[PDB]
Scaffold this active site. Structure first.
Site, PDB file in Angstrom:
ATOM      1  N   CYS A 172       0.800  -1.214   0.000  1.00 26.79           N
ATOM      2  CA  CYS A 172       0.000   0.000   0.000  1.00 26.79           C
ATOM      3  C   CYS A 172       0.846   1.284   0.000  1.00 26.79           C
ATOM      4  O   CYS A 172       0.270   2.394   0.168  1.00 26.79           O
ATOM      5  CB  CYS A 172      -0.906   0.030   1.233  1.00 26.79           C
ATOM      6  N   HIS A 303      -1.819   8.983   6.078  1.00 24.97           N
ATOM      7  CA  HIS A 303      -2.256   7.683   5.569  1.00 24.97           C
ATOM      8  C   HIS A 303      -3.362   7.146   6.477  1.00 24.97           C
ATOM      9  O   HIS A 303      -3.185   6.209   7.256  1.00 24.97           O
ATOM     10  CB  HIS A 303      -1.072   6.728   5.487  1.00 24.97           C
ATOM     11  CG  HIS A 303      -1.412   5.369   4.958  1.00 24.97           C
ATOM     12  ND1 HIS A 303      -1.404   5.070   3.614  1.00 24.97           N
ATOM     13  CD2 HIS A 303      -1.743   4.223   5.596  1.00 24.97           C
ATOM     14  CE1 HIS A 303      -1.728   3.802   3.444  1.00 24.97           C
ATOM     15  NE2 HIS A 303      -1.939   3.264   4.631  1.00 24.97           N
ATOM     16  N   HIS A 341      -9.743   3.037   0.342  1.00 21.98           N
ATOM     17  CA  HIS A 341      -8.345   2.630   0.300  1.00 21.98           C
ATOM     18  C   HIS A 341      -8.014   2.064  -1.070  1.00 21.98           C
ATOM     19  O   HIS A 341      -8.616   1.077  -1.494  1.00 21.98           O
ATOM     20  CB  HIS A 341      -8.072   1.590   1.390  1.00 21.98           C
ATOM     21  CG  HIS A 341      -6.622   1.298   1.623  1.00 21.98           C
ATOM     22  ND1 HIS A 341      -5.845   2.072   2.460  1.00 21.98           N
ATOM     23  CD2 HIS A 341      -5.813   0.325   1.122  1.00 21.98           C
ATOM     24  CE1 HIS A 341      -4.614   1.586   2.448  1.00 21.98           C
ATOM     25  NE2 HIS A 341      -4.573   0.521   1.661  1.00 21.98           N
TER      26      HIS A 341
END
Ligand SMILES: CC(C)(COP(=O)(O)OP(=O)(O)OC[C@H]1O[C@@H](n2cnc3c(N)ncnc32)[C@H](O)[C@@H]1OP(=O)(O)O)[C@@H](O)C(=O)NCCC(=O)NCCSC(=O)CC(=O)O
Ligand SMILES: CC(C)(COP(=O)(O)OP(=O)(O)OC[C@H]1O[C@@H](n2cnc3c(N)ncnc32)[C@H](O)[C@@H]1OP(=O)(O)O)[C@@H](O)C(=O)NCCC(=O)NCCSC(=O)CC(=O)O
Lengths: 935, 935
Positions: A172, A303, A341
């Site tokens: 990610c 984040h 996400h």
């Protein structure tokens, strides 16, 4: 043969992010994403775009792009077979990369051959399980259309980049690792640009089950910094950005201060556990290496996965590293609460939000932050403050984090670009916006957007930087006038083949009251007229007075007409030269041969204007007996046979129009005789002078003596077609320079215009440069049916500037490159940060008629010979209708690749007698293959 | 709380490849690969390891590693569930990375916490489809064990690296792309080491069919540079390398001059076509940026895929770039004709062959080069010469290419390390090689290899750098003597818990002729004896004479025995200290209290030797009445009750051994009385002196007056256990310093040996430092059954050096760290290039009893409460037999990754009354949980 080494030297200047593009959930382009973010619109929806809302028990809500079944295969030179067996992510990423390149003010020709590196970050190979479940022959092309190593490589192959093209997979936080690699390669000297990006689409419904089994995903949308946060929601992205050195960038959204990466190590809480110490150390290192005062950060793109173990640690690290010494709350935020996400495209999402914030200069609101997390003490001590509503970010530094699963963290800092726009002299006067696109609707939308920004000149410059692409890439060429009294808009499909530009200069008779008066609005036209008037003033001619306040009686004389027509032609030539139009050929009608000389470089402004002045002076001063001319409809041979002594044929206008000139009495007798029979005779206003006849013997010699001491001899290029010397005598020495002898011969001998119009090709774009479109009918009849014809001026027109702009827009629409901004002061690059984005226009201006294969849920669970050969070859490539595609597009432009060349050669051998090598196959067109089979 | 920023500064020194390891086709390790290459052994075989030879029509021959079903899960702290749901490529790569780390002279403790980056390159994701065809619960762990971003991350997580961990996918040229990234990051200053590597295993025959459909594969093995070449054969590799700054490297195979990457661009021959111009430009750029004379290249590792379109272009580029100016043929070669094409691990294959050519200093032969390719003019013009047989590469530069499919080329240059070995003073004398491993057979093979290289000291140093790993990682500890007259070898399994190393010093009676004579072979022992003899010479004692040519009559006196025993004790202490053994506790029997003080830092060599000299002088000079001593079998209380006046108990040796001392007549009467009844009395040679009695009143005072002016008072550490002052009086001021008062008290008061041996733990490792194992039986009886006992010397032994080495080997086998090379001059690092490889030893020394899941072809087509809670917790982790695993290994050490902690807590709550937090669960052992449940 020896190759010059490249100068690989470390770079110490600034790195600027220039273009941005991408597909986001419920957003077809960056503009839609910005609108949704700034209106608190949730991009995570519930529907059956990918699978049923609950299939295999997966969470109903997801972040999904509008469509993944669309792609312009023909534009990128990928055949149907290859496009079908290609990952939708790769297709969307190619489109987004092109859109970003166009957004940064770059084009296909400008970025071709540059030392650019591609750093795509992708990690989803689910399209290799669906396509392989029912594998059949012809699916081998997946190797070149589905491997993750082919994502950047294709970008390198299509755009012709010659720099490190690598694919990254850092979970990610891959998008920021790609940014770090681009910074590393730019600061050493390998590359000058970078195409850092990233794509992630969800296909398999079982991967969501995998993520649910590890407790990664939550129930509702990502509740970033919310006490009730329990996970994240998957999303889809296809984003890309373009980085360039700040000194060579035509648009700078911001500057990359620096990016760094680090790892967590052996933590006792598990591999899938964030390490607050690691993130804090990474932040401290990045802010200390660049000596950046951490207290200067205005906004912090966190984040914000929304988990109970990620947000507290990230906030603690931010408080310890960046909030130490801050005297005001630090505005934190994330884009995961808006669109979920993105998995391997979270860093690119954060970059896009940061760029949107630093372009619109407003911080997008954060959604779902109702109650602060009790485990985040920074939200109660005043150190942290989630931006729940639009906040006016004025300027400074913005930091972005990307903590990939496994402990591989990444940080980056961007410095805003503060170059607020200043007014341009333009933006209130008419301008010619020329552009190209793949579809008519796309070009119409582009023109609508241009009209929306008619007051911006930097936007026009950014559009123009990529408005000269060849017709092959963008066949729909169009032009519209911004800030126009009357609406104008033209859009035409231009074939791949490029037509030749010919400048046709008109002679006498284009005079009228107000000639060129409107065109004084343009600075260059007025400057040219002034620099000609200054030249002609010492000789007793006030060009400005004759042109502005001149009257019909004044233009009845001999001098003012010649002077004004030459001035208008020279000024229009200067306008065209400034606009960047190179004429592939030049032809003129007597008195327009001086303008042809000037435009051809064989003469100068002084020389041409004084040549016209001397012509008129010689005609007037000598007591030439009164004479008359007229264009009769007789053919050239008929006129030559039927003309008695004393009256001759002056100019051969067209196939059935010839100018007879002679003495007054004999001319009148000829008029009576011709009118007696059936013939159309039209008298031309020559001020009672019979040009190009024996009567011009005495003037011509005078002209020679007049111009021997002024006209320096210079060579005549082959582009300029003479219309005073017969074709067979072009090789003689007299037809080498436009000296006084050439002017005297032109003023004396006949005008062979039909031959010069014959030498023109069958599809040339001939522009008539003159005060009025005098020879429109003559030129159109002489040339043919396939030649485009345009006039830069119209007689007694209420507005000539609009006529000129419309004429050049028509010329561009048919495939002639030009720069409409050359008539105004050049815009200083990089442009102001207030310039709108060009990515949205290109995104919505694609050709998406065809729908290609996409992974499905069901796959995750388990007669003339010439035409004959034409159809066979077309089928080999994969074209259902051979006649549909263009006949001038080379095979390589479609995607022919090694195996197809051998197949084509074997098919030709088995079908006809041709034996063609593989190399020649990829560079031969359908029309060429038909020609050879005929031969 | 504040974190110190790291000094990220550009690095300008050299980068050296220090380690190498990997699995290659038909080669379990690097040694097998080297042997096969140098014996012209083809590694591409035909069998059914992956699928039938012809399944789905795929090529029969392939390059396959020996096995992919083996993995030491327990070593890497991965539980059974995770290991089962983990890519075999990742498992083999973790093993290979550990082997490479050990090969470069590094260890787990040395590389832990370093700024090391991991740059694994992996593209294959075929185990995702097979594992998903029949997906079931408990497979969610594939996310943390199957994702490609988890390959480097796991390496970072296990070894505790804190540097950029990224995964790369560039196709056939990914390994050199990771090397480029490692060079880029090392030179910027982020990292000090790099773990560049990559693995590629073939699992799906449909992938081979897909490659065949593109004409990639050929019929036979790769015919590199052969006119009949028509394709390549797939191979398998799991190699990895370690890079370090040349100044901090303990082993340097070579130096990385530089590596670079580039792309081909828009070529007209298709995306899957090599670009000769691009490769030539890359070569020119790399050889010009570093100013490397291209004519200096000795060997060229080409990317010999064997195709008809790849070899000619690569050879042309090499000829144009590196053969320009060469006066001799340039030796080209490849590692693809030996083991085929490794796909995403071809660059690592080339690196392995380059590190093997520059280590063995011989160029491996190239197979299947029968007829030169007619399209390669370099082979006929003499510019190129394929190395078909072993060629003696002496030294210089070696270049490696890696042209990935899609056009991403890569070049790298390595400079050979020329540090040929020079003889060491050792390698002809006995040495103690100590090491550790996971299995007994592995350690036996390691010892066999060490014996094979008994003449190499650099190899011993490289082994020792990683021979001190904790027993948890490598439970099998062993030791063997190289260059020994008698074979010795010990291997024992040492629990995770660390035992205590206690020094025990003996007293009188250890004398004998030749004491320490053999140990003179060691340099340190002789040096210590000389530096003590120089001290004692001015006082009329020639220690060297008494120790070398001394006789029994000489040792009958009082001085020489005391002097020699103290000298031996101090020399053995110096030997132990140089070897790097730190004692957790020190105890000694009277006369061994000076040695204890010396070893504890409370005294010095001068002070201790002079204290013994003064003791002996005071005993001899004074006319002490003759006395006798003897160890009776009576108990302490019995001896205290039964002793009449004049005879007392000197020392409490053990539970049933007490030393009675007293005057000759009374002592003889006691002997008669005790022998009359049933009691064992053994007389000890005390030179007719009754120590530790009233008779010692006068000597002790003298000693005090003797030592007041010599021994400086210094503190006594708690490690040293006094055996002269009662336990209850340790806190008094007298028991603070080993001043003259302490020596007098020890010489006067009794010896409480048994009490001193009670504070010793129940599993301590007591080393009896003395000329002979005098108190072996006494100490063994006093301590217990779980305490290891070793004697550094044996009386009348034919060889004491071997006895000393065997004693220390036994001590190491039970888990005491030490450095056997501290007795010899330190080896200068980096070691000579002639040092053998340590990767092969570790590769064949793994614990591979368990077989894990591997993708299959069929998947690609479609009662006490304490024990109850113990079993429940063990099942939660995934241990079938809870009692099998060690009771002192923490849960984090077995693979707990959160989630399981919550399950454990809930199970404990549902089963017992314990309520344990998640954090404490991962740091609590089985024995600890049993203790708390009992509580
Ligand atoms: C016959 C012509 C004069 C044109 O007559 P036509 O009536 O047939 O042309 P037409 O039907 O298209 O008329 C309408 C178009 O002409 C433009 N037009 C402009 N001025 C005009 C004028 N005085 N008379 C007629 N038309 C004119 C209009 O703006 C309009 O274009 P729009 O509405 O689109 O704007 C032409 O064929 C021609 O140029 N012949 C040669 C004349 C010549 O130059 N001889 C050389 C010697 S005199 C010389 O050159 C000086 C020297 O030798 O020294
Ligand atoms: C009884 C002992 C001497 C050991 O006799 P044992 O035979 O029973 O012990 P054992 O059988 O297990 O092994 C004996 C080991 O020691 C050696 N050994 C035994 N007797 C020896 C002797 N007279 N002379 C030389 N060496 C002897 C053996 O070779 C053997 O070596 P190997 O086993 O390697 O093959 C011991 O228990 C002891 O410490 N006795 C009391 C000594 C003492 O503490 N005096 C206190 C003050 S004297 C002092 O320190 C000086 C001072 O006070 O100033």
């Amino acid at each position: 043969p020896p190759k010059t080494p490249n100068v690989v030297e470390p770079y110490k200047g600034e790195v600027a992010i220039c273009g941005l593009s991408g597909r986001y959930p419920e957003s077809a382009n960056v503009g839609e994403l910005e609108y949704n973010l700034f209106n608190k619109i949730d991009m995570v929806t519930i529907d059956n775009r990918r699978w049923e809302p609950g299939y295999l028990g997966t969470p109903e809500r997801m972040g999904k792009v509008k469509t993944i079944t669309d792609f312009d295969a023909e534009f990128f030179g990928v055949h149907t077979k290859g496009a079908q067996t290609m990952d939708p992510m790769l297709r969307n990423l190619l489109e987004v990369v092109y859109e970003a390149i166009v957004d940064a003010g770059e084009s296909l020709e400008s970025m071709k051959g540059t030392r650019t590196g591609v750093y795509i970050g992708v990690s989803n190979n689910e399209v290799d399980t669906a396509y392989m479940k029912n594998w059949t022959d012809d699916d081998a092309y997946m190797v070149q259309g589905c491997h993750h190593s082919m994502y950047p490589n294709w970008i390198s192959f299509f755009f012709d980049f010659s720099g490190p093209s690598t694919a990254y997979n850092t979970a990610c936080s891959t998008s920021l690792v790609c940014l770090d690699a681009a910074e590393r390669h730019l600061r050493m000297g390998v590359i000058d640009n970078a195409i850092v990006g990233g794509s992630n689409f969800i296909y398999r419904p079982a991967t969501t089950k995998l993520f649910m089994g590890m407790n990664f995903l939550g129930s509702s949308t990502c509740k970033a910094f919310d006490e009730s946060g329990d996970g994240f929601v998957r999303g889809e992205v296809a984003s890309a950005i373009l980085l360039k050195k700040a000194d060579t960038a035509k648009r700078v959204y911001c500057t990359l201060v620096g990016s760094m990466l680090n790892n967590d190590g052996n933590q006792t809480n598990g591999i899938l556990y964030p390490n607050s110490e690691a993130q804090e150390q990474l932040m401290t290192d990045i802010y200390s290496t660049h000596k950046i005062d951490a207290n200067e950060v205005k906004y912090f793109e966190c984040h914000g996965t929304g988990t109970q173990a990620g947000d507290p640690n990230e906030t603690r690290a931010i408080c310890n590293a960046v909030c130490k010494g801050k005297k005001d709350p630090l505005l934190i935020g994330s884009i995961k609460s808006n669109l979920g996400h993105g998995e391997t495209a979270s860093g690119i999402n954060g970059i896009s939000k940061v760029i949107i914030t630093m372009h619109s200069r407003q911080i997008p609101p954060n959604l779902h932050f109702k109650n602060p997390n009790p485990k985040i003490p920074g939200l109660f001590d005043g150190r942290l403050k989630v931006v729940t509503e639009t906040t006016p970010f004025d300027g400074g530094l913005i930091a972005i984090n990307s903590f990939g699963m496994g402990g591989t963290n990444a940080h980056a800092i961007f410095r805003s670009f503060d170059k607020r726009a200043e007014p341009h002299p333009a933006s209130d006067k008419p301008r010619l916006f020329t552009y190209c696109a793949r579809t008519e609707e796309g070009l119409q939308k582009i023109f609508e957007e241009a009209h929306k920004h008619a007051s911006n000149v930097e936007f026009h410059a950014l559009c123009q930087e990529s408005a000269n692409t060849k017709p092959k890439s963008l066949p729909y060429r169009g032009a519209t006038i911004l800030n126009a009294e009357g609406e104008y808009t033209e859009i035409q499909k231009c074939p791949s083949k490029a037509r030749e530009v010919w400048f046709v200069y008109s002679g006498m008779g284009s005079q009228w009251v107000g000639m060129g008066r409107s065109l004084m609005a343009l600075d260059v036209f007025r400057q040219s007229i002034e620099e000609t008037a200054a030249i002609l003033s010492p000789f007793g001619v006030d060009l400005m007075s004759l042109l502005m306040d001149g009257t019909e009686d004044k233009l009845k004389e001999i001098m003012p007409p010649f002077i004004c027509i030459n001035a208008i032609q020279l000024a229009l030539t200067d306008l065209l030269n400034s606009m960047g139009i190179v004429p592939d050929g030049l032809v003129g009608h007597s008195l327009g041969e001086v303008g042809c000389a000037y435009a051809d470089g064989c003469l100068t402004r002084r020389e041409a204007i004084l040549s016209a002045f001397w012509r008129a002076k010689a005609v007037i001063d000598c007591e030439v007996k009164p004479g008359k001319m007229a264009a009769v409809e007789l053919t050239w041979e008929e006129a030559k046979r039927l003309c008695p002594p004393g009256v001759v044929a002056a100019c051969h206008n067209s196939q059935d129009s010839v100018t007879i000139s002679g003495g007054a009495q004999e001319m009148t007798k000829f008029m009576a005789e011709l009118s007696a029979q059936g013939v159309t005779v039209k008298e031309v206003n020559s001020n009672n002078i019979s040009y190009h006849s024996s009567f011009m013997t005495e003037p011509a010699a005078y002209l020679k003596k007049g111009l021997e001491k002024e006209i320096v001899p210079k060579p005549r290029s082959k582009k300029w077609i003479s219309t005073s010397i017969p074709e067979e005598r072009w090789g003689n020495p007299e037809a080498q320079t436009a000296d006084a002898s050439y002017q005297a011969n032109n003023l004396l001998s006949s005008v062979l215009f039909y031959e010069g119009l014959q030498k023109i090709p069958s599809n040339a774009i001939a522009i008539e440069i003159a005060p009025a479109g005098l020879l429109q009918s003559v030129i159109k009849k002489s040339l043919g049916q396939d030649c485009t014809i345009v006039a830069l001026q119209k007689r007694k027109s209420p507005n000539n500037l609009e006529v000129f702009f419309s004429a050049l827009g028509k010329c561009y629409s048919h495939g002639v490159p030009m720069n409409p901004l050359g008539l105004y002061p050049a815009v200083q690059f990089p442009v102001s940060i207030d310039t709108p984005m060009l990515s949205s226009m290109v995104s919505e201006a694609w050709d998406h008629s065809a729908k290609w294969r996409v992974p499905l849920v069901e796959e995750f669970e388990y007669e003339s010979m010439v035409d004959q050969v034409l159809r066979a070859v077309g089928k080999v490539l994969g074209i259902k209708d051979v006649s549909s595609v263009d006949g001038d597009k080379e095979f390589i432009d479609m995607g022919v690749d090694s195996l197809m060349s051998v197949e084509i050669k074997q098919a030709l051998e088995r079908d006809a007698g041709l034996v063609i090598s593989t190399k020649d196959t990829q560079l031969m067109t359908f029309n060429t293959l038909r020609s050879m089979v005929k031969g």
